Each structure stands twice: as C-alpha cells, then as structure tokens.
C-alpha cells in the first residue's frame, strides 16, 4: 500500500499500463525469463534471445555458468537499463553436493545452521536459508537462498570441510533471481514459437505470456509515484521535486534507492531518496529524489 500525498488524475493519451503496451513497446521495455539450458553460456543465451526476437540489444542478469540451468532473466532493448537493480533481492538455488565421505543427516543439519547467516568468500555474503531437501549416502540435495554474488561452488566446498571431509558441487539450478521465479521461466523453444505465432498467425497471445514488462523486475523497490506533468522533465534529467509527487511508499529512508513511476505504473527511473516518507508528506517544496538513471524514453509524456 502507498500513501497518497495528492490525489491526481492521469492522462490516458500518454503512456499506458505496462501490461497493456502495444506489442512493440512490450518488447521495447520487456524481459524474458529464460530457463537456461545446460551447456551454453549465459551470453550465448542472451544472444539467442536477441536473434529470436530480431532485436538490436539484449542482456542477461546474474550470470549462470555453462552447466548451470534455471532462471536467467534477459532484458530486451531499453529494459537492459534496469539490470543493475536485479542484484538487490536474494537469489535461490537447488544444489546437488557430493561429499567425499558420508556424513550423518544430523551433522549436515547442524552445519547448515552454522552456515546460515554471514559467511566469507573470495567478501562477506549472507546466507538466508539452507534447507536439506534429500540425501542418499554422500549425495546431498539442498536449497539455498542467498545474497547475490555468493559462489555456490565454494559454499559446497566449505560445507564439506565443516563436516570434517570435503565436497564438490555436482549440479546447480537457479530457482529465483531478482523478482523472477521458476514459475516465470520459459524455454527458448517456446519463446521462438511465440515470435513465429506473432509474425505469422498475427497472434500476440504467446508473446504476451512469455515477455514480462520490465516493471515486473523492479517490484522490490520502494516507490515514488509522480504526476504526469513531472514525467517528461524527469526523462530529460530533472530530479523529483516534492510538488511532483502524488503517492509514495511508506518507510522510504534518506539515501534509499527508489523507483520513480507514473500514475499508470510505468517505471520512469531510479534514484536516491533525499527525504524520508514523512518529510515528503510534510514538505511543500524541495527535491525528493536524486535521479540516477532514466528508464523511459523522452517524449513519452508531455513536455511542460
């Protein structure tokens, strides 16, 4: 829920609901969550997406190694500008680890607790959850929710050593990255077919099912919703002033990264909060957000 600072109307002659974009614009500001195949590099995958949709630009998020499968968000065209925000939320993986010597289930559970929290790797990374999914002798299958940048291969080795033996990662599959989950993932074959269905059968249904608006990958950020009259200015480099805000998230703290959205829910840009939610609510003047990157094309909304 957002706090309303000022009730304002939006002009439906400009922009639109992110999920109701014309097909070309959905692609322009879209993201395809690919279920990465075992074998190709993450770069080969973004390249394929680029070729499949006949795009000029595409980029993936958290790099997955060649043998790793799973959630691999691939930003399309303008959406590539949003990739830097994807590392913020935690990631999750299912991993198959092979111990050098068998260990009891009780000792594994104990060590998982020991690793739950802050750990060190070459950096301090946080391990939010570590769950034992299944075990068969030296083969241990576990789920891990962790901070971006955490090397799972190294985590398996350290867990092996903590058990009094050694271990190596056998298989890894990412189930969550950024705001995307496995349920959002699509096979490249289905993305290819979706495109063909649009280009041939003139049907956008499949493309709309597989391409998500970039706003979907920015849901973890607190928001500052601005009036229509402030949008184009922001797209041209202006910061967000108190008087241009219609609604905002509760608990925004100074220095916090926030998403600037239109009244229709379109991502305009991201920046650092210069004031907290209350100051913004009490102020009648001042600069609310120091804009750091613009996502929306100039001229989408009216210049004032």
């Amino acid at each position: 829920e957002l706090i309303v600072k000022e009730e304002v109307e939006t002009n439906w002659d400009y922009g639109c609901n992110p999920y109701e974009r014309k097909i070309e614009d959905l692609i322009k500001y879209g993201v395809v969550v690919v279920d990465k195949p075992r074998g190709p590099t993450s770069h080969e995958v973004s390249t394929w997406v680029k070729k499949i949709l006949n795009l000029d630009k595409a980029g993936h998020g958290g790099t997955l190694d060649p043998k790793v499968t799973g959630v691999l968000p691939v930003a399309l065209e303008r959406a590539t500008k949003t990739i830097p925000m994807w590392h913020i939320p935690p990631k999750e993986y299912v991993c198959l680890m092979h111990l050098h010597r068998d260990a009891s289930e009780e000792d594994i559970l104990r060590v998982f607790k020991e690793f739950t929290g802050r750990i060190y790797q070459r950096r301090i990374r946080k391990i939010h959850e570590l769950e034992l999914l299944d075990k068969d002798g030296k083969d241990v299958l576990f789920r891990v929710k962790c901070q971006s940048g955490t090397y799972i291969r190294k985590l398996c080795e350290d867990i092996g050593e903590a058990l009094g033996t050694s271990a190596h990662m056998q298989e890894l599959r990412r189930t969550k990255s950024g705001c995307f989950e496995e349920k959002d993932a699509v096979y490249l074959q289905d993305l290819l077919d979706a495109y063909v269905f649009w280009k041939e059968d003139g049907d956008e249904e499949e493309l709309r099912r597989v391409i998500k608006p970039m706003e979907y990958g920015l849901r973890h950020l607190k928001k500052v919703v601005v009036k229509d009259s402030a949008v184009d200015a922001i797209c041209h480099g202006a910061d967000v002033y108190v008087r241009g805000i219609a609604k905002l998230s509760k608990g925004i703290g100074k220095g916090e990264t926030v998403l600037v959205e239109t009244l229709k829910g379109e991502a305009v840009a991201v920046g650092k909060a210069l004031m907290n939610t209350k100051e913004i609510l009490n102020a009648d003047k001042g600069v609310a957000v120091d804009v750091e990157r613009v996502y929306m094309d100039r001229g989408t909304y009216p210049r004032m």
Binding site: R38, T69, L133, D134, D136, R173, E182, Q189, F197, D201
Partner: protein
C-alpha cells in the same frame, strides 16, 4: 552418478525416482537442448496450433 529430480506435479526437488509427496515418476529438471536450427519447430508449432483451436 546421482542427478537431481523434480516432481512434474508438486514441483518439488528430490533425488527419488518417485515423488514422496505426490506419486508421479520424477523427471530431470533440465530444459530441452536448443539450437537456432529449430529442427522440429514446424511440427511443434503445428501441434500447438491444432491443440489450440480445440481445447
């Protein structure tokens, strides 16, 4: 060599050949191999089209 499995129904990950919470034979989570060649693409799309103007 052990390989992780996943239940096609519950979507749970396990090492068992049969899900312990549902019943169906578990499957390998890996996505089908892909190539721009899209060898059987025509047939695959043929099926989707037919299946769609039906159920």
């Amino acid at each position: 060599e052990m390989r992780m499995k996943k239940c096609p129904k519950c979507g749970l990950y396990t090492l068992k050949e049969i899900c312990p919470k549902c019943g169906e034979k578990t499957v390998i989570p890996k996505p089908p191999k892909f190539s721009l060649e899209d060898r059987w693409g025509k047939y695959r799309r043929m099926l989707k089209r037919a299946l769609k103007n039906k159920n």
